[PDB]
Amino acid sequence: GVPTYGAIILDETLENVLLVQGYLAKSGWGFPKGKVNKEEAPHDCAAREVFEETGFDIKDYICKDDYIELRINDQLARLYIIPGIPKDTKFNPKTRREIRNIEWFSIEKLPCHRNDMTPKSKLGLAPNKFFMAIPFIRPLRDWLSRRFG
């Protein structure tokens, strides 16, 4: 799979994260990210996708070693961690045919797993609108504890 790059943007309190909501197959909430182009460096792809999806340019804030990377079904997703972005920042996608909405969410209120359906004796997981964000929540919480405390 082609790697994806993007960002976990946090505000100044470190309480909130910026998620974006797409359409159709991308209809839920997720971190801003997208597919790397031929010959494009990871940091440039992260900045490009985030600027396309949010209108906010992270290029001056990216730290090379500060990211969470996950491999999910054989596709690598790396999100650079970008703290301290004011909550009154005006975010606007370039792409509103791709992005429905852009919101801050409390990190502590976000799920870090899906819920099963053990009440119904049925296998699998209940739908959750944060499903794409979910895999990064626990690693982010652990990263913030280690880096800031």
Binding residues for Mn(2+): 49, 53
CA distance 113 to 138: 9
Q: Where would I find the H helices in the chain?
A: 42-54, 134-147
CB 19, min distance to ligand LFP, A: 7
**Where does this chain bind ligand LFP (CB under 6 A)?**
20, 22, 25-26, 28, 30, 32-34, 53, 98-99, 132
Side-chain-side CA neighbours of 135 within 13 Å: the count stands at: 13
d(CA 87, CA 25): 28
Residues linked to residue 7 through DSSP beta bridges, in sequence order: 80
Shorter beta-carbon distance to ligand LFP: residue 28 or 139: 28
Quote the least distance from Cβ 143 to ligand LFP, whole Å. Answer: 20
Look at residue 116 and give its three-state secondary structure.
Answer: strand
Residue with smaller CB distance to ligand LFP, 26 or 141? 26
Minimum distance, C-beta of residue 29 to ligand LFP, in the bound complex (Å): 6
Going by the annotation, the residues of the binding site are 49, 53
